[PDB]
Enzyme design. Sequence first.
Site, PDB file in Angstrom:
ATOM      1  N   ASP A  73      11.347  44.060  12.423  1.00 29.90           N
ATOM      2  CA  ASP A  73      11.100  45.544  12.723  1.00 29.90           C
ATOM      3  C   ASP A  73      12.392  46.068  13.615  1.00 29.90           C
ATOM      4  O   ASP A  73      12.210  46.539  14.572  1.00 29.90           O
ATOM      5  CB  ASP A  73       9.794  45.367  13.802  1.00 29.90           C
ATOM      6  CG  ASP A  73       9.239  46.814  13.787  1.00 29.90           C
ATOM      7  OD1 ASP A  73       9.926  47.733  14.273  1.00 29.90           O
ATOM      8  OD2 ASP A  73       7.982  46.854  13.857  1.00 29.90           O
ATOM      9  N   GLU A 102      13.176  55.474  15.187  1.00 29.68           N
ATOM     10  CA  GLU A 102      11.699  55.477  14.750  1.00 29.68           C
ATOM     11  C   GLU A 102      10.952  55.179  16.049  1.00 29.68           C
ATOM     12  O   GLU A 102       9.925  55.987  16.289  1.00 29.68           O
ATOM     13  CB  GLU A 102      11.593  54.570  13.874  1.00 29.68           C
ATOM     14  CG  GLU A 102      10.418  54.593  13.083  1.00 29.68           C
ATOM     15  CD  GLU A 102       9.292  53.536  13.673  1.00 29.68           C
ATOM     16  OE1 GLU A 102       9.084  52.479  13.401  1.00 29.68           O
ATOM     17  OE2 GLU A 102       8.537  54.296  14.654  1.00 29.68           O
ATOM     18  N   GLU A 103      11.382  54.144  16.707  1.00 28.66           N
ATOM     19  CA  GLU A 103      10.160  53.543  17.743  1.00 28.66           C
ATOM     20  C   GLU A 103      10.120  54.397  18.920  1.00 28.66           C
ATOM     21  O   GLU A 103      10.960  54.965  19.526  1.00 28.66           O
ATOM     22  CB  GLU A 103      10.746  52.118  18.099  1.00 28.66           C
ATOM     23  CG  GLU A 103      10.314  51.210  17.116  1.00 28.66           C
ATOM     24  CD  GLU A 103       8.769  50.715  16.924  1.00 28.66           C
ATOM     25  OE1 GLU A 103       7.712  51.700  17.394  1.00 28.66           O
ATOM     26  OE2 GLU A 103       8.352  49.649  16.722  1.00 28.66           O
ATOM     27  N   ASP A 120       9.842  48.605   5.767  1.00 29.53           N
ATOM     28  CA  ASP A 120       9.825  48.195   7.066  1.00 29.53           C
ATOM     29  C   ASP A 120       8.977  46.903   7.262  1.00 29.53           C
ATOM     30  O   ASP A 120       8.065  46.675   6.336  1.00 29.53           O
ATOM     31  CB  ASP A 120       9.037  49.380   7.687  1.00 29.53           C
ATOM     32  CG  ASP A 120       9.456  49.916   9.022  1.00 29.53           C
ATOM     33  OD1 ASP A 120      10.780  49.922   9.087  1.00 29.53           O
ATOM     34  OD2 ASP A 120       8.878  50.136   9.829  1.00 29.53           O
ATOM     35  N   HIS A 130       3.388  43.574  17.680  1.00 29.63           N
ATOM     36  CA  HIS A 130       4.570  43.945  18.427  1.00 29.63           C
ATOM     37  C   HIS A 130       4.826  42.991  19.570  1.00 29.63           C
ATOM     38  O   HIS A 130       4.263  43.561  20.658  1.00 29.63           O
ATOM     39  CB  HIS A 130       4.582  45.278  18.888  1.00 29.63           C
ATOM     40  CG  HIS A 130       5.315  46.290  17.987  1.00 29.63           C
ATOM     41  ND1 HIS A 130       5.117  47.538  18.218  1.00 29.63           N
ATOM     42  CD2 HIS A 130       6.432  46.013  17.283  1.00 29.63           C
ATOM     43  CE1 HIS A 130       5.976  48.479  17.254  1.00 29.63           C
ATOM     44  NE2 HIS A 130       6.837  47.422  16.845  1.00 29.63           N
TER      45      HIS A 130
HETATM   46  O1  LIG Z   1       4.968  52.017  17.816  1.00 26.68           O
HETATM   47  C1  LIG Z   1       3.686  51.606  18.037  1.00 26.68           C
HETATM   48  N1  LIG Z   1       3.146  50.964  19.311  1.00 26.68           N
HETATM   49  C2  LIG Z   1       1.770  50.494  18.940  1.00 26.68           C
HETATM   50  C3  LIG Z   1       0.885  49.937  19.679  1.00 26.68           C
HETATM   51  C4  LIG Z   1      -0.400  49.778  19.192  1.00 26.68           C
HETATM   52  C5  LIG Z   1      -0.898  50.153  17.840  1.00 26.68           C
HETATM   53  C6  LIG Z   1       0.185  50.934  17.314  1.00 26.68           C
HETATM   54  O2  LIG Z   1      -0.374  51.269  15.788  1.00 26.68           O
HETATM   55  C7  LIG Z   1      -1.274  52.298  15.889  1.00 26.68           C
HETATM   56  C8  LIG Z   1      -0.679  53.375  16.296  1.00 26.68           C
HETATM   57  C9  LIG Z   1      -0.051  54.171  15.106  1.00 26.68           C
HETATM   58  O3  LIG Z   1       0.597  53.137  14.077  1.00 26.68           O
HETATM   59  C10 LIG Z   1      -0.465  52.631  13.397  1.00 26.68           C
HETATM   60  C11 LIG Z   1      -1.865  52.172  14.269  1.00 26.68           C
HETATM   61  C12 LIG Z   1       1.523  50.966  17.572  1.00 26.68           C
HETATM   62  C13 LIG Z   1       2.649  51.523  16.990  1.00 26.68           C
HETATM   63  C14 LIG Z   1       2.578  52.296  15.706  1.00 26.68           C
HETATM   64  C15 LIG Z   1       3.615  51.789  14.830  1.00 26.68           C
HETATM   65  C16 LIG Z   1       3.376  51.675  13.283  1.00 26.68           C
HETATM   66  C17 LIG Z   1       4.179  51.360  12.336  1.00 26.68           C
HETATM   67  C18 LIG Z   1       5.572  51.071  12.722  1.00 26.68           C
HETATM   68  N2  LIG Z   1       6.577  50.218  12.017  1.00 26.68           N
HETATM   69  C19 LIG Z   1       7.745  50.116  12.837  1.00 26.68           C
HETATM   70  N3  LIG Z   1       7.316  50.481  13.992  1.00 26.68           N
HETATM   71  C20 LIG Z   1       5.865  50.852  13.828  1.00 26.68           C
HETATM   72  C21 LIG Z   1       5.051  51.569  14.861  1.00 26.68           C
HETATM   73 ZN   LIG Z   2       8.179  48.111  15.656  1.00 25.84          ZN
END
Ligand SMILES: O=C1Nc2cccc(OC3CCOCC3)c2/C1=C/c1ccc2[nH]cnc2c1
Ligand SMILES: [Zn+2]
Length: 313
Positions: free
Chosen positions: A117, A156-157, A200, A282
């Site tokens: 990631d 992105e993050e 990803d 994560h």
């Molecule tokens: O950054 C984030 N922290 C979170 C903590 C809890 C739930 C989460 O997911 C929810 C909210 C939005 O996304 C899908 C459901 C996330 C999250 C999203 C995400 C989704 C795909 C990704 N690809 C690379 N980084 C990514 C991050």
């Molecule tokens: Zn990530």
Amino acid sequence: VPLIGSLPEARLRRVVGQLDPQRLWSTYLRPLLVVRTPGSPGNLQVRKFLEATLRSLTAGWHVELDPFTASTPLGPVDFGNVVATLDPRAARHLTLACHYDSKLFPPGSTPFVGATDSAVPCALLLELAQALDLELSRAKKQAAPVTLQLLFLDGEEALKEWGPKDSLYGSRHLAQLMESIPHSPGPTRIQAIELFMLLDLLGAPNPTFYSHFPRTVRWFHRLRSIEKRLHRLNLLQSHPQEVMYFQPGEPFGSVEDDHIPFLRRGVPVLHLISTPFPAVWHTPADTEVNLHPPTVHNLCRILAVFLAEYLGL
Ligand SMILES: O=C1Nc2cccc(OC3CCOCC3)c2/C1=C/c1ccc2[nH]cnc2c1
Ligand SMILES: [Zn+2]
């Protein structure tokens, strides 16, 4: 076992053979496994590694930087994307994308380098531009009309947990710049993108992919057809069943990722993301050790083929 457009089995092997797993693991993956939250000494280290690795290629990649700054919960922040375009004057191109920033976690916890990631993708893209370099170099010498573009997106993050204005800093900006830049034909550089293939969350063992877009399901099928062959040719590791990664189906429907700014603007998007997410996204348990090198080297292999069938290399 092969569709139409497919490679002949002789090339394919020859091609595959140009991949060098030791390079992938030790040259392009291992040194991205730092901490690279936006505007960090490491987020800088990686950015420069990418720029210079890609610029070291014979094919002549035109590599620009997309430096910018945006208001975010941690204040003003210095972002910087890495856009590498093999042939800028060609009319359209395949775009492989992925982000190279690591999410920012609170301080003190074991440091988060997000192996899946998204370093394993970043590395894949590199190995692909290297393995197929002379091939891509040819096409560029023979004025091929569809070239290859590698996007390594910063930011992105989120920095203080998701939100429209705290997420996708890098993508939302390059899609903004790309829409301003005129192109012939076009009219903008956004139309240059014939297909937005977005890697990803790759490298965890036993992933599963799906077609989140019926506009592009044609290419997912191919991606699945490229799996077995290879399985049917004894060229995948640890692949007992025949179809395993690219499964058939339809939805979820969407998950928010770097592709969004470009879909608002009407781009074809193959989201090539593991659904479900690794059992380690994560956590600080996303690390070189929890990957599955075989699964990595197969994805690389599949992709490599795709790239060769797509651009007629
Ligand atoms: O950054 C984030 N922290 C979170 C903590 C809890 C739930 C989460 O997911 C929810 C909210 C939005 O996304 C899908 C459901 C996330 C999250 C999203 C995400 C989704 C795909 C990704 N690809 C690379 N980084 C990514 C991050
Ligand atoms: Zn990530």
